[PDB]
């Protein structure tokens, strides 16, 4: 068929609108090269690029067949030749998700003027949440070259305006994640396992004091880890098994982590803390690999060393790199998760780097930033839906 | 805030109409539930669901500023409370996939009616491609236990106009595909190599013979593999080389391989064919997994024996099954593509078996059946696009 003739149903839906226009269609020499319909609130959209003959396309006939049909029922129709139009739409090249508790007009206008402002055009919003946190998606075709201008602008909208805003690469490769580390403490587990062990010892407001200075960036990391576990001196080591014992998990872990099993993910945990406390619960859940540091006992007493290696900042990244090298994933591929400065080079060497709650010094290099306490927020930022979520788990 | 408003914003698109209408918002309390934009043929709808008080839900200020900005610019509104109305759309149960070359839409409409006849609500359609086959993508709502009747009717659908459609899950689990097999003859690679074999002992016919009545089902793949070996008997083993320097991927084979790996599938081939000509491709291919059947040698000449055990097609599945357990991945996870009777069980215990233009013996079985010489139209129905492969290819 030589031409192509674009027709386009707008209106009020109602059932079987679809059916009827290509069955009126098909009394005419049509072939299709695209078709377009999504209802939203009730509104209808069905955009039908077709070819035929320029013989049918420029006789009455098919005009009056489509115009009568359609108006009958109550919607609307335009039809009109193309030619010059394209087939089928491009890829957008980036997604902007935005959550929050609540997401004002005000702020979703900030987001909004800021993508404007650097000619980006959004391609779609839609909802990804309603729960734990109201969540929003925008697909967009950003300039060559923006994008780094982009995640900056939409930065400071998202600290001013109190909402979440992560600007991602939404190309085939770039998209299929399929690693992922959590940082432990204050990340996967509520709170500090090193205060914890303080407190046993009447030691936790100086163990918490230095721990909030390196997870700000301030110290060291081994200066700061050395001088947090000699605090611990004298402790018996059945200490270790009670802390175990009262570890939470941050609100979201198990959904998170059940998502993303489901999902085929590989799962597993870098930590500066203590392998005697994290194995048991890696196992629990089932993670894939742990990496973590190593407490000393002599005749089952702490003696407020650890066995080295330390795992540091520089070796938080090292252990990634291992993991995604021992499960073949490309590190393009991996995503890393934390909340302290501690995190930085594991969160940069990632393919996506998320600080959740975190200290500013790691929020300010990260690839995407959460402030809301639910873990599973994560799982957004995946591309994975609440009613996604809802629904694989009420199968079982 | 007490009570929600829906606004629902249509007509032809205008740069900036987002920005504005948040902007508009942000005078009266408004924070946000939903929103839902697309532009389909330079239409426009963007719906707003938000919750705002009482009070201003419903007083006159908050109408007639978002009904004067939206006029003023030449788009249409309403404004309605609502209180109701769902927060945020159910996910689609199922897709369905319709390649054609041509696509008539007699045939688009005979899939619109089967849906309507059986209770499935149409979610969303778009195009997945325009190359090498247009291809079209309807997200769909299927009431419990409908599924098969859906298969069932759009099969014949199928067959009787000309186009290829397959109907999947589309929940969270079941579209996280990760482990792909493929047969190699006349699936990964263009014709017969056991016919390119008994051609060097002027045979060709005999054994093609034999090799089509095995691949429609009718005789039993074993007795049938020995039948057609023997043939060979007398070859010296340098045939084997001659013929793995002959062969030619089927048509997209290589954009298939590519994009798969792009997305982290792990990827192999299982065939009743000879291992000393599949390795030399499947190292080049950089596949995963091998297995083959092994042909007898001495003295540098084949005997026309095996060298068992025999794969057949309870060994098909035998060894995706190994593959799908080595790589960590659930068969509900796996792909397996093929086109002769001695792919059944093997398309039956992968969670996706598609049938690559198939015996009638293996389509009838198939989840999902392809018709056209290309073998890239497997990847649409793992739920990528044409423009999605042209984008990645092209950045390297
Ligand atoms: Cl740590
Ligand atoms: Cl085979
Ligand atoms: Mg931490
Ligand atoms: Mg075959």
Same mark, same amino acid.
């Given at each position: ?19 009827? @226009? ?53 919607? !609307?129709?335009?039809?009109? =030749? ?12 980036? $997604? ?93 587990? #509520? ?14 407001? #100086? ?7 390196? &997870?700000?960036?301030? @110290?060291?990391?081994? #200066?700061?880890? #050395? ?10 080591? /059945?200490?270790?098994?009670? *802390?175990?014992?009262?570890?939470? @998990?941050?609100?979201?872990?198990? /959904?998170?982590?059940? $998502? ?25 859940? &089932? ?13 089952? $007493?702490?003696?407020? =060393? ?22 073949? *994933?490309? &590190? ?13 080079? &594991? ?15 790691? =929020? ?28 694989? !788990?009420?199968?079982?």
């Amino acid at each position: 068929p030589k031409v192509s003739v674009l027709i386009t149903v707008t209106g009020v839906d109602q059932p079987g609108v679809t059916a009827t @226009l290509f069955e009126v269609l098909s009394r005419h020499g049509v072939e299709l090269l695209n078709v377009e319909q999504v209802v939203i609130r009730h509104r209808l959209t069905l955009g039908v690029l077709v070819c035929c003959p320029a013989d049918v396309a420029d006789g009455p006939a098919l005009r009056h067949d489509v115009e009568a049909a359609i108006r009958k029922v109550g919607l !609307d129709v335009s039809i009109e =030749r193309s030619d010059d139009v394209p087939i089928i739409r491009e890829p957008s090249t980036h $997604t902007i998700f935005v959550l929050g508790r609540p997401i004002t007009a005000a702020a979703f206008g900030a987001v909004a003027r800021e993508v404007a402002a650097l000619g980006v055009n959004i391609d779609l919003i839609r909802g990804v949440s309603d729960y734990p946190v109201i969540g929003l998606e925008l697909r967009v075709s950003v300039p060559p070259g923006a994008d780094e201008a982009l995640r900056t602008a939409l930065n400071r909208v998202s600290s001013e305006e109190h909402v979440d805003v992560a600007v991602e690469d939404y190309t085939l490769e770039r998209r299929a994640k399929r690693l992922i580390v959590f940082d432990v403490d204050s990340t996967l587990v #509520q709170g500090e396992v090193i205060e914890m062990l303080a407190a046993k010892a009447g030691a936790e407001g #100086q163990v918490a004091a230095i721990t909030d200075a390196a &997870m700000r960036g301030e @110290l060291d990391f081994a #200066q700061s880890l #050395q001088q947090r576990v000699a605090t611990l001196a004298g402790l018996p080591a /059945t200490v270790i098994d009670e *802390v175990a014992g009262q570890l939470e @998990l941050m609100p979201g872990a198990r /959904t998170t982590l059940r $998502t993303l099993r489901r999902l085929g993910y590989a799962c597993g945990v870098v930590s500066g803390g203590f392998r005697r406390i994290i194995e048991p619960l890696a196992e629990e859940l &089932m993670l894939d690999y742990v990496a973590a540091n190593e407490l000393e006992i002599v005749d089952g $007493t702490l003696t407020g =060393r650890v066995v080295g290696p330390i795992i540091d900042r520089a070796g938080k990244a090292t252990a990634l790199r291992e993991f995604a090298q021992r499960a073949g *994933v490309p &590190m393009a591929q991996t995503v890393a998760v934390g909340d302290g400065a501690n995190d930085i080079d &594991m969160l940069a060497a990632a393919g996506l780097g998320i600080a959740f709650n975190a200290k500013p010094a790691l =929020r300010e290099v990260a690839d995407a930033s959460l402030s809301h306490p639910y873990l599973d927020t994560v799982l957004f930022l995946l591309g994975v839906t609440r009613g996604e979520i809802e629904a694989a !788990d009420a199968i079982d």
